[PDB]
Design a protein around this ligand. Structure first.
Ligand SMILES: NC(=[NH2+])NCCC[C@H](N)C(=O)O
Ligand SMILES: [Mg+2]
Ligand SMILES: [Mg+2]
Ligand SMILES: [Mg+2]
Ligand SMILES: [Mg+2]
Ligand SMILES: [Mg+2]
Ligand SMILES: [Mg+2]
Ligand SMILES: [Mg+2]
Ligand SMILES: [Mg+2]
Ligand SMILES: [Mg+2]
Ligand SMILES: [Mg+2]
Ligand SMILES: [Mg+2]
Ligand SMILES: [Mg+2]
Ligand SMILES: [Mg+2]
Ligand SMILES: [Mg+2]
Ligand SMILES: [Mg+2]
Ligand SMILES: [Mg+2]
Ligand SMILES: [Mg+2]
Ligand SMILES: [Mg+2]
Ligand SMILES: [Mg+2]
Ligand SMILES: [Mg+2]
Ligand SMILES: [Mg+2]
Ligand SMILES: [Mg+2]
Ligand SMILES: [Mg+2]
Ligand SMILES: [Mg+2]
Ligand SMILES: [Mg+2]
Ligand SMILES: [Mg+2]
Ligand SMILES: [Mg+2]
Ligand SMILES: [Mg+2]
Ligand SMILES: [Mg+2]
Ligand SMILES: [Mg+2]
Ligand SMILES: [Mg+2]
Ligand SMILES: [Mg+2]
Ligand SMILES: [Mg+2]
Ligand SMILES: [Mg+2]
Ligand SMILES: [Mg+2]
Ligand SMILES: [Mg+2]
Ligand SMILES: [Mg+2]
Ligand SMILES: [Mg+2]
Ligand SMILES: [Mg+2]
Ligand SMILES: [Mg+2]
Ligand SMILES: [Mg+2]
Ligand SMILES: [Mg+2]
Ligand SMILES: [Mg+2]
Ligand SMILES: [Mg+2]
Ligand SMILES: [Mg+2]
Ligand SMILES: [Mg+2]
Ligand SMILES: [Mg+2]
Ligand SMILES: [Mg+2]
Ligand SMILES: [Mg+2]
Ligand SMILES: [Mg+2]
Ligand SMILES: [Mg+2]
Ligand SMILES: [Mg+2]
Ligand SMILES: [Mg+2]
Ligand SMILES: [Mg+2]
Ligand SMILES: [Mg+2]
Ligand SMILES: [Mg+2]
Ligand SMILES: [Mg+2]
Ligand SMILES: [Mg+2]
Ligand SMILES: [Mg+2]
Ligand SMILES: [Mg+2]
Ligand SMILES: [Mg+2]
Ligand SMILES: [Mg+2]
Ligand SMILES: [Mg+2]
Ligand SMILES: [Mg+2]
Ligand SMILES: [Mg+2]
Ligand SMILES: [Mg+2]
Ligand SMILES: [Mg+2]
Ligand SMILES: [Mg+2]
Ligand SMILES: [Mg+2]
Ligand SMILES: [Mg+2]
Ligand SMILES: [Mg+2]
Ligand SMILES: [Mg+2]
Ligand SMILES: [Mg+2]
Ligand SMILES: [Mg+2]
Ligand SMILES: [Mg+2]
Ligand SMILES: [Mg+2]
Ligand SMILES: [Zn+2]
Ligand SMILES: [Zn+2]
Lengths: 53, 110, 203, 141, 69, 181, 116
RNA sequence: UCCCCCGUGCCCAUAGCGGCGUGGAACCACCCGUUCCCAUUCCGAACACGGAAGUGAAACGCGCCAGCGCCGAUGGUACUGGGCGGGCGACCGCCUGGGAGAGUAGGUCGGUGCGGGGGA
RNA sequence: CGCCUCCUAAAAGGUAACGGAGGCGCCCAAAGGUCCCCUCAGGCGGGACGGAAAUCCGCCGGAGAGCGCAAGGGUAGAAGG
RNA sequence: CUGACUGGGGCCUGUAGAGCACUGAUAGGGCUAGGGGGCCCACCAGCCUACCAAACCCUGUCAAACUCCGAAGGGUCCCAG
């Protein structure tokens, strides 16, 4: 992790709870990450969006 | 020095053997298609079938399909049910795929 | 010439025992036989300096046999510079690979110019029937200078004896002599200090 | 004078001097050799001294063969320092030499010339030596 | 063959200046040229276009022989 | 397959003279054409106008075959070269298209070459394959002076089943390859 | 690249575009068009394809041109340089060959002024 | 059970490189085509399909050659567990048990399991 | 001054010195999962611009290439493309 | 009754020694690019070298951080004292 390589949270797009924490290079991947992850509250897979940490 | 044929044969067949299941190996010539089920631990063939054996007709795809059911027919009579399909150096397609679909029609579980 | 040597059989004697009885431990073999032998060290030496690995020694074995052998291997005591074991290769009627001496004929001109005949090979390894060992193989070195050379290709071989080393293998050469008038240049010779080989992100 | 053109490492550990020579124990090139009778680190300066003495006796003629190379870096701390604070500076190179080695051979010269040059060479060396003649045992090697 | 990437080859009429018609295949159904194998000097043996010369130098001068002897 | 004068000329006139000239005892021993390879070693459209598609569209007309990209295996300081950069084109002509291309090459293309002296007879692989160069692309009938902009040539490989130069020279010369000497 | 090894410009008259071929000047322009009866003033564009091949054939077969002209004229210069004659000595240095003075000028054969 | 071919394994170059010779009934290749399923950063080369005129040329298989490559004793030595001596030392010896590597003789142009096709 | 690699280290593991040598304080949205296909470096010969080295063709070439970065281990019957 | 130690048996190891197949070192010789020097040339090529010498090979060697090899021992498990 550095200034360019940030830590970030993944928020379930449906119920809105952050379920995952990961990292990206916001110069290499300047867009908000969108990732299908398992959400344990919805208890199904859902698109997760990068949300500020 | 190995070929792309030999590396392929080795690669798919190494992964099959890792699973440890009996392998439905298929050989395919310009004319015929041959299939035997092999216990790799005893290094012994269990049951065989070929277009050259049953002296099957013409269209290689339907011929391969029938050697599949034939391989199945004798297979299940020997207690064989589950197996792993060894396409070796062949892409799962046409003739080799027809033999598979026919072998499954017989009741070979794979 | 053809040399002789009393030889004796051994079984369980220790080599060190044999070597303090003045006896040289040995072995005899070919594709048919293999026997542990010894040969009285003083008698062997007097034979080996005359009959290196080129000429035949016949071993008078104590069982009444007399077998024609070439010395195939002499193990020396690296510490004391003394023979410590001999391989006797028992010949049969079939061909064999062996070393045959090179007898350098003539006086090189580059040697008359001050040079030095560097005799890289004093024998050559050559396949030949045993009924047919040449005493040597003459070599004309008279027309060599500094720095000319000969090879096994230039070896003119007698009958029934074929080269068994690559004819591209140099055998003689004539180099310049040692000369004091080079010392001052070699003494006043700055040397760049050694270089370590770069490790890591430097290479 | 003799020393590696280059090396993978600058500083070798000291090692031992036990045993007879590994190899180099037979006259392999010339007509007479100078054989080492006891172990030592032979420095480059020693080797060069022994060479120069042999060419200087030969005046002009003959060929000297040097069959030892000083590749071991020899290190020494600067004077009047304490122990510690790292390994000393490489100050020379030596050739490990063990009983049996043939350090030098000669060719192209009378027997008296080789016996004498090789004797003078021995005096320059930090050890005992013998003078050997190329033998049939040497040829059989 | 893959489709959509390859220009169709069709029967083609090449025409050179020497009235040669080539019954070949191409992407242009009818092309002209100014030369062809049926007329090129290297091909047509040695139709040495102009200078079938002899040089004619450096002895063919011969203007003349009238100097005395 | 198509009826092509060259292909027909191989079997009728070139095949039996080869058998004659060498005495083969199998029909497959006689030299055959296997492939022709074309390669514009561009190296100019690296970081310059990478729309070398102009030449891709050029070769596609010459061969009737869409060439494929060639990219650099390593970066090179002095060539302004970075690993992976596009630096040319290659197209593998076989069978009917190989014959049709060689046909126009030996008929139309080679003669249009500036001051044509004939092909370099010492350019045979050593293995019985042949390679020649070109300095232009107007050499072909399908490239008209109007539609062209810059001057690009190509490298040509004509691969043969013949094991030797001597056999391969016979095949190509019999087919109509004009050799200077 | 039609005639004759070159591609003569359109938009211009033939006689004048024929000069744009190594080996043809105004003279050989009005000695070609007259021999094959094509009006000199005719624009290269408006050339009949039969007119063209008649224009090609005459100039390509009567006069040494383009490559082959450059070929010999080098050998002419090559041979003077080799027989060791005074015209060749001026070629082997790049010096003016036709008597001109060299104290000053002679910048055409010398090129721009090499300072000192 | 005996030979030949086709599969598929085991040992892991004594199995390889090279040279030569041989095989097409069968089988296997190449082959013949690219309609069709499928395929080419281009290419029916490969992959794939439908075929059956030809050829064992390539590949494959089988023999044969020791130039290379690989394997390699016996004997002797180094070294050494344990036991003892000697030298100011650098170091050197002896007993008992173990015992290389290099090299030498020499070996090798594979051996074998299982199923399938053919041959007596 | 913490961490990684090699050696020292006495053929299990571990083992010290202000002993011999290098690295880390990152990075990758693919440089990650899986399926499918592919096989290097290098050397010889051949080919416009084109060279020691760009791209192309042939032959040889068990891994000396590659695996983001030190070093070691591992590795093409892939961990490489 | 499992212990130290000991018997037999299996597996793990990379030291001692040795080696040069790798990474490096290395003296000489052979061979043979590139250079230096000398005849000849500037007209672009040649010819000669007791000069320095890449790569290849040969003879002969070196290495804690080299290993195609490789012990004695050591470790550990089972059975037995
Ligand atoms: N048998 C033995 N374990 N010997 C080991 C070496 C013994 C003694 N140091 C010697 O050099 O002889
Ligand atoms: Mg196929
Ligand atoms: Mg004695
Ligand atoms: Mg110390
Ligand atoms: Mg000292
Ligand atoms: Mg010290
Ligand atoms: Mg210190
Ligand atoms: Mg110190
Ligand atoms: Mg010193
Ligand atoms: Mg020594
Ligand atoms: Mg002394
Ligand atoms: Mg045919
Ligand atoms: Mg050639
Ligand atoms: Mg060929
Ligand atoms: Mg054109
Ligand atoms: Mg002009
Ligand atoms: Mg088989
Ligand atoms: Mg064969
Ligand atoms: Mg045959
Ligand atoms: Mg057949
Ligand atoms: Mg037949
Ligand atoms: Mg179609
Ligand atoms: Mg259809
Ligand atoms: Mg399709
Ligand atoms: Mg096809
Ligand atoms: Mg057919
Ligand atoms: Mg064949
Ligand atoms: Mg195959
Ligand atoms: Mg072994
Ligand atoms: Mg051995
Ligand atoms: Mg032994
Ligand atoms: Mg002890
Ligand atoms: Mg001892
Ligand atoms: Mg002992
Ligand atoms: Mg013992
Ligand atoms: Mg050992
Ligand atoms: Mg051994
Ligand atoms: Mg030796
Ligand atoms: Mg045999
Ligand atoms: Mg073999
Ligand atoms: Mg073979
Ligand atoms: Mg088998
Ligand atoms: Mg088995
Ligand atoms: Mg069987
Ligand atoms: Mg620290
Ligand atoms: Mg350790
Ligand atoms: Mg440790
Ligand atoms: Mg340890
Ligand atoms: Mg230990
Ligand atoms: Mg532990
Ligand atoms: Mg400190
Ligand atoms: Mg640091
Ligand atoms: Mg991707
Ligand atoms: Mg990966
Ligand atoms: Mg390559
Ligand atoms: Mg090249
Ligand atoms: Mg090139
Ligand atoms: Mg060029
Ligand atoms: Mg690597
Ligand atoms: Mg780094
Ligand atoms: Mg008990
Ligand atoms: Mg216990
Ligand atoms: Mg216990
Ligand atoms: Mg025990
Ligand atoms: Mg070691
Ligand atoms: Mg050691
Ligand atoms: Mg080495
Ligand atoms: Mg060796
Ligand atoms: Mg050591
Ligand atoms: Mg060593
Ligand atoms: Mg170590
Ligand atoms: Mg071994
Ligand atoms: Mg053990
Ligand atoms: Mg134990
Ligand atoms: Mg213990
Ligand atoms: Mg044990
Ligand atoms: Mg007990
Ligand atoms: Zn949710
Ligand atoms: Zn024409």
């Amino acid at each position: 992790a550095s200034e360019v390589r940030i830590k970030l949270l993944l928020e379930c797009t449906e119920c809105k709870r952050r379920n995952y924490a990961t990292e990206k290079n916001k110069r290499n991947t300047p867009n908000k990450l969108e990732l299908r992850k398992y959400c344990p509250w919805c208890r199904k897979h859902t698109v997760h969006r990068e949300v500020k940490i | 020095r190995l070929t792309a044929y030999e590396r392929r044969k080795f690669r798919v067949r190494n992964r099959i053997k890792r699973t440890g299941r009996l392998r439905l190996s298929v050989f395919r010539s310009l004319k015929h298609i041959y299939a035997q089920i092999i216990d790799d631990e005893k290094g012994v063939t269990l049951v065989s079938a070929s277009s050259l054996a049953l002296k099957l007709k013409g269209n290689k795809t339907e011929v391969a399909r029938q050697v599949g059911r034939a391989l199945a027919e004798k297979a299940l009579a020997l207690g064989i049910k589950q197996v792993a399909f060894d396409r070796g150096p062949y892409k799962y397609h046409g003739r080799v795929k027809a033999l598979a679909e026919g072998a499954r029609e017989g009741g070979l579980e794979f | 010439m053809e040399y002789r040597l009393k030889a004796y059989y051994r079984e369980g004697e220790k080599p060190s025992a044999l070597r303090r009885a003045g006896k040289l431990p040995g072995v005899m073999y070919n594709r048919h036989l293999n026997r542990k032998v010894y040969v009285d060290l003083v008698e062997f030496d007097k034979v080996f300096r005359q009959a290196s690995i080129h000429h035949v020694i016949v071993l008078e074995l104590p069982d009444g046999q007399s077998l024609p052998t070439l010395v195939r291997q002499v193990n020396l005591d690296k510490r004391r510079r003394r023979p410590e074991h001999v391989d006797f290769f028992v010949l049969s009627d079939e061909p064999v690979e062996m070393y045959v001496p090179l007898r350098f004929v003539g006086t090189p001109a580059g040697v008359r110019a001050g040079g030095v005949l560097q005799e890289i090979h004093r024998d050559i390894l050559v396949k030949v029937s045993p009924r047919n060992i040449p005493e040597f193989i003459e070599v004309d070195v008279s027309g060599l200078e500094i720095g000319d050379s000969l090879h096994a290709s230039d070896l003119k071989l007698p009958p029934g004896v074929e080269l068994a080393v690559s004819p591209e293998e140099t055998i003689a050469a004539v180099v310049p002599p040692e000369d004091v008038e080079k010392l001052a240049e070699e003494a006043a010779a700055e040397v760049a200090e050694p270089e370590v080989i770069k490790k890591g992100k430097e290479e | 004078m003799l020393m590696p053109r280059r090396m993978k490492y600058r500083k070798q550990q000291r090692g031992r001097l036990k045993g007879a020579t590994k190899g180099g124990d037979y006259v392999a090139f010339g007509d007479y050799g100078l054989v080492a009778l006891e172990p030592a680190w032979i420095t480059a300066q020693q080797i060069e001294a022994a060479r120069v003495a042999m060419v200087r006796h030969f005046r002009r003629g003959g060929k000297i063969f040097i069959r030892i190379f000083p590749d071991k870096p020899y290190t020494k701390k600067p004077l009047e320092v304490r122990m510690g604070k790292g390994k000393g500076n490489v100050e020379g190179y030596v050739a490990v030499v063990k009983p049996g080695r043939v350090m030098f051979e000669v060719a192209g010269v009378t027997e008296e010339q080789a016996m004498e040059a090789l004797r003078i060479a021995g005096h320059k060396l930090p050890i005992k030596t013998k003078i050997v003649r190329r033998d049939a045992y040497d040829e059989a090697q | 063959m893959k489709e959509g990437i390859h220009p169709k080859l069709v029967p083609a009429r090449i025409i050179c200046g020497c009235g040669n018609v080539i019954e070949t295949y191409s992407t242009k159904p009818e092309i002209y040229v100014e030369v062809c194998s049926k007329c090129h000097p290297f091909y047509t043996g040695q139709q040495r276009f102009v200078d079938t010369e002899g040089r004619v130098e450096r002895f063919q001068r011969r203007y003349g022989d009238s100097y005395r002897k | 397959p198509l009826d092509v004068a060259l292909k027909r000329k191989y079997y009728e006139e070139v095949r039996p003279e080869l058998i004659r000239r060498f005495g083969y005892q199998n029909v497959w021993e006689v030299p055959r054409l296997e492939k022709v390879v074309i390669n514009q070693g561009l190296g100019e459209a690296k970081e310059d106008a990478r729309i070398l598609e102009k030449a891709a569209q050029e070769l596609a007309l010459i061969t009737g075959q869409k060439p494929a990209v060639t990219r650099a295996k390593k970066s090179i300081s002095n060539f302004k070269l970075r690993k992976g950069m596009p630096i040319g084109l290659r197209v593998t002509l076989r069978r009917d298209r190989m014959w049709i291309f060689l046909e126009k090459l030996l008929n139309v293309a080679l003669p249009r070459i500036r001051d044509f002296r004939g092909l370099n007879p010492n350019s045979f692989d050593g293995r019985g394959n042949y390679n020649l160069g070109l300095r232009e692309q107007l050499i072909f009938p399908e490239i008209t002076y109007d539609m062209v902009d810059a001057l690009r040539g190509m490298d040509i490989a004509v691969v043969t089943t013949a094991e030797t130069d001597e056999e391969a020279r016979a095949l190509l010369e019999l087919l109509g390859f004009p050799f200077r000497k | 690249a039609r005639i004759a090894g070159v591609e003569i410009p359109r938009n211009k008259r033939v006689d004048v575009a024929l000069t744009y071929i190594y080996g043809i000047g105004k003279a050989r322009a009005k000695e070609a068009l007259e021999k094959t009866g094509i009006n000199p003033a005719t624009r290269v564009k408006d050339l009949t394809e039969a007119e063209v091949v008649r224009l090609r054939e005459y100039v390509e077969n009567t006069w040494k041109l383009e490559g082959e002209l450059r070929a010999e004229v080098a050998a002419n210069i090559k041979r003077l340089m080799d027989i060791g004659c005074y015209r060749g000595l001026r070629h082997r240095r790049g010096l003016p060959v036709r008597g001109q003075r060299t104290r000053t000028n002679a910048r055409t054969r010398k090129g721009p002024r090499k300072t000192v």
